[PDB]
Design an enzyme around this catalytic site. Structure first.
Site, PDB file in Angstrom:
ATOM      1  N   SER A 117      -3.167   0.427   7.486  1.00 29.36           N
ATOM      2  CA  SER A 117      -2.910  -0.345   6.331  1.00 29.36           C
ATOM      3  C   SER A 117      -1.415  -0.749   6.339  1.00 29.36           C
ATOM      4  O   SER A 117      -0.794  -1.144   5.374  1.00 29.36           O
ATOM      5  CB  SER A 117      -3.225   0.526   5.086  1.00 29.36           C
ATOM      6  OG  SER A 117      -3.325  -0.060   3.811  1.00 29.36           O
ATOM      7  N   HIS A 168       0.900  -1.206   0.000  1.00 24.89           N
ATOM      8  CA  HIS A 168       0.000   0.000   0.000  1.00 24.89           C
ATOM      9  C   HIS A 168       0.912   1.221   0.000  1.00 24.89           C
ATOM     10  O   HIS A 168       0.517   2.356  -0.170  1.00 24.89           O
ATOM     11  CB  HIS A 168      -0.913   0.103   1.263  1.00 24.89           C
ATOM     12  CG  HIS A 168      -1.716   1.357   1.438  1.00 24.89           C
ATOM     13  ND1 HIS A 168      -1.434   2.223   2.440  1.00 24.89           N
ATOM     14  CD2 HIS A 168      -2.790   1.748   0.730  1.00 24.89           C
ATOM     15  CE1 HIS A 168      -2.364   3.156   2.174  1.00 24.89           C
ATOM     16  NE2 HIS A 168      -3.207   2.973   1.213  1.00 24.89           N
ATOM     17  N   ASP A 175       5.038  -5.420  -4.930  1.00 27.94           N
ATOM     18  CA  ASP A 175       5.703  -4.425  -4.175  1.00 27.94           C
ATOM     19  C   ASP A 175       6.570  -5.153  -3.112  1.00 27.94           C
ATOM     20  O   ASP A 175       6.293  -5.186  -1.901  1.00 27.94           O
ATOM     21  CB  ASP A 175       4.902  -3.167  -3.678  1.00 27.94           C
ATOM     22  CG  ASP A 175       5.935  -2.007  -3.687  1.00 27.94           C
ATOM     23  OD1 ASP A 175       7.095  -2.212  -3.208  1.00 27.94           O
ATOM     24  OD2 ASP A 175       5.591  -1.025  -4.315  1.00 27.94           O
TER      25      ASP A 175
END
EC number: 3.4.21.90
Lengths: 171, 171
Positions: B123, B49, B71
């Site tokens: 997050s 994120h 990622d």
């Protein structure tokens, strides 16, 4: 003895008596204090071990003409700025006994403090008189196990910049 | 029992806050705190994120090589630092009862906490054990009604990516 007048201090109630500089400015690289700067002479004798860490970007770009045959930066800065830092040099008086610590002898071309007083993070501190004139800048040193030899750039009235020991390290 | 019949003697300051021990460092993306980083694993696993990670200015610039397919970040810092961060993971020990607030409830095979995650940056909070070791990163959650059930990505020995209770709400 016999005293016929008193004119010593002895009527003071003062909060401060602090001599150690605070006209200095810390200079940043990666958010860490990698040295201490001040603006001493007519053309500014500072960045020389604190030119690799920069000062501020705005400042870095304007100033920098150098003599890299000495690894020294020189170039004047406005008089207003110098007023709000340290003072110019044009001489070498031996009023210096302050730099960080209580006695730097200048004899034999090297500034010495006792051994084990000198350690890293002392790189960039000026050697200051009582008037705040910086006669030499500490760039580094070496423990000699009796003294700590100090490495300096100078600019006086006889100069000879980069008067250093031949077995010093740049911390 | 062997040794002292108390955990610790009289002190005015406890070594821990309750049982948690904070060590988390904020990570920025467009000025806003969209997570926290604190180095978990073998090649490092936080962003899910976020792009870019901040735990020290010196580390951030050094670390960044990436595999942009989930990622994933690759790099490993000094061992002195690493200890102070989080512990590696490949296996599931049981201890997880903290991620933020130390009363995370275990019911219906899922960890849930009452509302209080509606602020940004929940997050990329880690789920760490009683002492600590992060098997997984809180990716999001879903409100059951006045409470938040958690969505997670993990790297334990139970595998499974994107555990949904209902949906995964990134704040």
């Amino acid at each position: 003895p016999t005293q016929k007048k008193k004119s010593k201090p002895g009527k003071r109630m003062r909060n401060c008596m602090k001599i150690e500089n605070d006209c200095i400015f810390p200079v940043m690289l990666d958010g860490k204090v990698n040295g201490y700067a001040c603006l001493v002479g007519d053309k500014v004798m500072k960045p020389a071990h604190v030119k690799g860490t920069i000062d501020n970007p705005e400042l870095a770009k304007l100033t920098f003409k150098k003599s890299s045959k000495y690894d020294l930066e020189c170039a004047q800065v406005p008089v207003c700025m110098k007023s709000d830092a340290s003072k110019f040099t044009h001489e070498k008086p031996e009023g210096h006994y302050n730099w960080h610590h209580g006695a730097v002898q200048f004899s034999n071309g090297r500034f010495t403090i006792p051994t084990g007083s000198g350690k890293p993070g002392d790189s960039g501190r000026p050697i200051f008189d009582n008037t705040g004139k910086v006669v030499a800048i500490v760039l580094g040193g070496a423990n000699e196990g009796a003294r700590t030899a100090l490495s300096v750039v100078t600019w006086n009235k006889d100069m000879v910049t980069r008067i250093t020991p031949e077995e010093s390290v740049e911390w």
